């Protein structure tokens, strides 16, 4: 039915929300991380699962922390969107008896990946593909007030360019 412009590339972007650490709240958080980035194709939220308890002075590795997104767009458009639209990763507290609580948000600057080294790889038909990867730890800032670092998020992202869409 519906085509895309021939100059579109097939990209694969993946986010690994690997761990959280340095909880600065005095109480235990039953943590999930949740995000939406409709540029990748859907506003449907992605979240870690199940919840994991986080207390002070520990690194907790998140389950179901990895997601890869295959999408088609123009290189120019990916550049502008990654420069202008931050990836907002929400820290939620979950409990069986209580309603879900939003504690804070990490703002991930996707364009950090664009300055990383581009490395070559080959696609499933020997075509020239490129990969960039970037890793850092970023602050989760409290949801209601401002500038209050409540947790750190260690993540990795990868961007693969499979070249022109087929």
Author numbering: 447 to 612
What does the primary publication say about this deposited structure?
While the linker between C2A and C2B is short, the linker between C2B and C2C is ∼100 residues long and enriched with proline and charged residues but largely non-conserved and without predicted secondary structure elements. Our structures revealed neither complexed Ca2+ nor potential Ca2+-coordinating top loop residues or cationic β-grooves. Prime candidates for interaction interfaces in these domains are the regions defined by strands 3 and 4 at the edges of their β sandwich that constitute their most conserved parts.
Using X-ray crystallography, we show that the ciliopathy-associated centriolar protein CEP120 contains three C2 domains. CEP120, for example, plays a key role in the duplication, elongation, and maturation of centrioles, which in principle could impact the production of a functional basal body (Comartin et al., 2013, Lin et al., 2013, Mahjoub et al., 2010, Wu et al., 2014). All three C2 domains of CEP120 (C2A, C2B, and C2C) adopt the PLC δ1-like topology II and are structurally similar to each other (root-mean-square deviation [RMSD], 2.4–2.6 Å), with major differences found mainly in their loop length. Thus, the CEP120 C2 domains probably play a role as protein-protein interaction modules.
